[PDB]
């Protein structure tokens, strides 16, 4: 029986809960929705980093084809090319390019999962496809919520639940931890997702930044069939 | 506005989330249900410790009036007087006595909350009274779930939700973290408590130990009006 666990934030990752597992990183509003979208639109790779300084250094390494995106406090970073809205990573803008990004939550969670056997990037947009990859990988799972500012966040949690549910649709040989069971419960009783996310503290932040469009987009189910994977510092 | 947070397990306590707050420790199956019951039945004090060796040493300090209780793996510890069933701490057995105890989860969570301004002991049995003490104390709150074996546990989580709900019944000037909001949600949609706890991994453990009686008892609401408090290594 495949085991499924959940970690509630980037500041609550412990190696022993991650190593040798299938880790699924979630930051649905908005980092993993961005990564998922960009790669689906023909982006060559995403390189997540922790600091702006390291991001500017990484540009020089990848040459003409590198672009700078992400955010601090949800805002575009001075001197970057793009922000952290999935809509701005259109095929025209990203095809074949190398996206250097650093974000408030998502990028920390990705780096924090290094010891896993496979690091998958998950979101509402590719939830079904992630569940399918989870089953294929046939290994125990930990769903790593980025949270927001090192705290449990309802958006990442319900999205975990959706994905767990999709895994369950594909098989019965499962054992959930109580954290996973609870996420799945929250999802199962709020399938539309949108409604319940409005209780997240982070939702007020998304609203005061005028990101209603990004919010509605990131709640769309199963529009991306791709499962990005972090490997040796790169996501393809 | 009073802030309410939640910590999901004894292994997830971070000082900065606890210091100077009102901390409410929960291990409803069964340590905090025991402490609550024992003190309500006229027990003089409870002294929680981390090891059996430290427990045997503490007996010598408190003399004739000391008794030994708690558990490992839910079982009575060799040479102890009582186990970790609330029913065995009757008034006849505990009145005026000093209860030295060590348990798998609850006692770790209590010690882990030392830096709080006030450490309260909470359970389903004294949930309402805890909420009343929380309001009186008029300080920000963290609800510290003991969990089981360092993991998020549905029993402690729903019990947190019940208590948060009771605080809400007594006031509107609140700000919940997403973790607290989620617990309250789980409770609010499962008010009877009993039903939903049966999904906890720990429930199977309680059942295979034949503790159906303890389980039904620990799910009883508002039968104890006392709020035990941990102060300088002692609970009164
Ligand atoms: O704090 C924020 O608003 C950011 O985390 C928003 S986002 O990660 O770009 O979605
Ligand atoms: O592992 C266990 O069964 C114990 O934690 C049970 S109890 O804490 O005595 O309720
Ligand atoms: Mg997030
Ligand atoms: Mg417990």
From Swiss-Prot, chains A, B:
Organism: Clostridium acetobutylicum (strain ATCC 824 / DSM 792 / JCM 1419 / IAM 19013 / LMG 5710 / NBRC 13948 / NRRL B-527 / VKM B-1787 / 2291 / W)
Family listed: Belongs to the ComB family.
HAMAP family: ComB
Pfam family, any one: 2-ph_phosp
Protein keywords: Hydrolase, Magnesium
Protein name: Probable 2-phosphosulfolactate phosphatase
Keyword Magnesium recorded: yes
Top-level taxon of the source organism: Bacteria
Catalytically driven reaction(s): (2R)-O-phospho-3-sulfolactate + H2O = (2R)-3-sulfolactate + phosphate
Cofactor: Mg(2+)
Its EC number(s): 3.1.3.71
InterPro entries per record: ComB-like, ComB-like_sf
Record GO terms (molecular function): 2-phosphosulfolactate phosphatase activity; magnesium ion binding; sulfopyruvate decarboxylase activity
PANTHER family: 2-PHOSPHOSULFOLACTATE PHOSPHATASE-RELATED
């Amino acid at each position: 029986h495949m085991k499924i666990d959940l970690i509630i934030s980037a500041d609550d990752i412990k190696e022993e809960k991650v190593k040798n597992k299938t880790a699924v990183v979630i930051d649905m509003l908005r980092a993993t929705s961005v990564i998922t979208t960009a790669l689906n639109n023909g982006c060559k790779r995403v390189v997540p980093v922790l600091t702006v300084e390291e991001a500017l250094k990484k540009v020089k390494e990848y040459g003409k084809d590198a672009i700078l995106g992400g955010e601090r406090k949800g805002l575009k970073i001075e001197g970057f090319d793009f922000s952290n809205s999935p809509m701005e990573y259109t095929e025209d803008v990203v095809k074949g390019k190398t996206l250097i990004m650093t974000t408030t939550n998502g990028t920390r969670a990705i780096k924090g999962s290094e010891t896993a056997r496979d690091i998958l990037i998950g979101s509402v947009l590719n939830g079904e496809a992630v569940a399918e990859k989870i089953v294929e990988l046939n290994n125990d799972v930990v769903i790593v919520n980025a949270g927001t500012y090192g705290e449990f966040s309802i958006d990442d949690f319900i999205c975990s639940g959706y994905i767990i549910n999709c895994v369950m649709d594909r098989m019965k040989k499962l054992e959930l931890t109580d954290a996973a069971t609870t996420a799945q419960y929250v999802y199962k009783t709020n399938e539309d997702i949108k409604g319940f996310v409005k209780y997240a503290k982070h939702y007020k932040r998304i609203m005061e930044l005028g990101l209603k469009k990004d919010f509605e987009y990131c709640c769309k189910k199963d529009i991306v069939k791709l499962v990005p994977q972090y490997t040796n510092g790169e996501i393809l």
